[PDB]
Design a protein around this ligand. Structure first.
Ligand SMILES: COC(=O)c1cnc(Nc2cnc(C#N)cn2)cc1NC[C@H]1CNCCO1
Ligand SMILES: COC(=O)c1cnc(Nc2cnc(C#N)cn2)cc1NC[C@H]1CNCCO1
Length: 258
C-alpha cells in the first residue's frame, strides 16, 4: 500500500492548476502534488536538480491530459508570509534567508539553469525554516557545453524583473536572477516593493536612480544592507554586482543575532 497517497488539502493555486498536499497511507510522508492540465521542460529541469536550497523533485505521472509533479512539501510555507507588510522581518532572519537564497542561485547558475521568476511566493520554507527555491515552470538552460546563450523572452513578475528585460532585445541570464534577489532582499527588509516596474516612466524607479534613499522603502533599511542593495540594483547589467562579489559584501559577512 506504499504507493497509495491521500489528498489532504489544496495548498495553493497556479495558472495551470492546483498544488495539493498528499500524504502517504503507510509512511505518512507528505508531498506537494503540482497538477497541470512547457511542462516537459519543467520536468526535465527538475530531474537535473539536487540541492538543499532547491525544492526536491520525487517524480511525475501523466494521466490523459492531466500531468502530476511530485514535489517537496515545505511545511513552513512561503517566505512571502514571513514578510510583515510595511515592516519586513528582523535583519538577522533576512540575512540568513538571503544567504540560503544565494546558495540555491549559485547552485542553479552552476548547472547552467536560470529560474527567471525569483520572488517570495516562490521561496518556500521547510520545517526548520530552510529556504528552498520553487517552481521551475519558467526556468531555462542559459549555459550548455560551457557556452552561454543569451535570453530574449519576456518573463517573470514586473516588480521583480531587471530593467534590461524591458529595454534590450537580448540579455545575460545571471544578472536578471541577481536583480530579483535584490528585490526580495528589499521586501524582507522593508515589507514593501520599491516600484511597480524598473522603467523610465516609473517615478519610484527614477527616485532610486537619483539616489533619493531618504524616501521609503530605503529609509527603513540600515546603511550596511542598503550599501549591498546599491550594488545589486544597478541599471546596467554589465556593471551590476556578481554573486561571487555579493559573498564578499560587508553586510553579507556581518555577524547578526536576534
Ligand atoms: C520518491 C519517489 N517517488 C515518489 N513518488 C510519488 C508518487 N505519487 C505521489 C503522490 N501523490 C508521491 N510520490 C515519491 C518519493 N518520495 C516521497
Ligand atoms: C504550508 O505549506 C505550503 O503552503 C506549501 C508547501 N510546499 C509546497 N510545495 C511546492 C513545491 N513545488 C512547487 C512547484 N512548482 C509548489 N509547491 C507548496 C505550498 N504551498 C503552495 C504555494 C507555493 N507557492 C506558490 C503557490 O502555492
Amino acid at each position: 500500500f506504499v504507493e497509495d497517497w491521500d489528498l489532504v488539502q489544496t495548498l495553493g493555486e497556479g495558472a495551470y492548476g492546483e498544488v495539493q498536499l498528499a500524504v502517504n497511507r503507510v509512511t505518512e510522508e507528505a508531498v506537494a502534488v503540482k497538477i497541470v492540465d512547457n511542462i516537459k521542460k519543467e520536468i526535465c529541469i527538475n530531474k537535473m536538480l539536487n540541492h538543499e536550497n532547491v525544492v526536491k523533485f520525487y517524480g511525475h505521472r501523466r494521466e490523459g491530459n492531466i500531468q502530476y509533479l511530485f514535489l517537496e512539501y515545505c511545511s513552513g510555507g512561503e517566505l512571502f508570509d514571513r514578510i510583515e507588510p510595511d515592516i519586513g522581518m528582523p535583519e538577522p532572519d533576512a540575512q540568513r534567508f538571503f544567504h540560503q537564497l544565494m546558495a540555491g542561485v549559485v547552485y542553479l547558475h552552476g548547472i547552467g539553469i536560470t529560474h527567471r521568476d525569483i520572488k517570495p511566493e516562490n521561496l518556500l520554507l521547510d520545517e526548520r525554516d530552510n529556504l528552498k527555491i520553487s517552481d521551475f515552470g519558467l526556468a531555462t538552460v542559459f549555459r550548455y557545453n560551457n557556452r552561454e546563450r543569451l535570453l530574449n523572452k519576456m518573463c517573470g513578475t514586473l516588480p521583480y524583473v531587471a530593467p534590461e528585460l524591458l529595454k534590450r532585445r537580448e540579455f545575460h541570464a545571471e544578472p536578471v536572477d541577481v536583480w530579483s534577489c535584490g528585490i526580495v532582499l528589499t521586501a524582507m527588509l522593508a515589507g514593501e516593493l520599491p516600484w511597480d516596474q524598473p522603467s523610465d516612466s516609473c517615478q519610484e524607479y527614477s527616485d532610486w536612480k537619483e539616489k533619493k534613499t531618504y524616501l521609503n522603502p530605503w529609509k527603513k533599511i540600515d546603511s550596511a544592507p542598503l550599501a549591498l542593495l546599491h550594488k545589486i540594483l544597478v541599471e546596467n547589467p554589465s556593471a551590476r554586482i556578481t554573486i561571487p562579489d555579493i559573498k564578499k559584501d560587508r553586510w553579507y559577512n556581518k555577524p547578526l543575532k536576534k
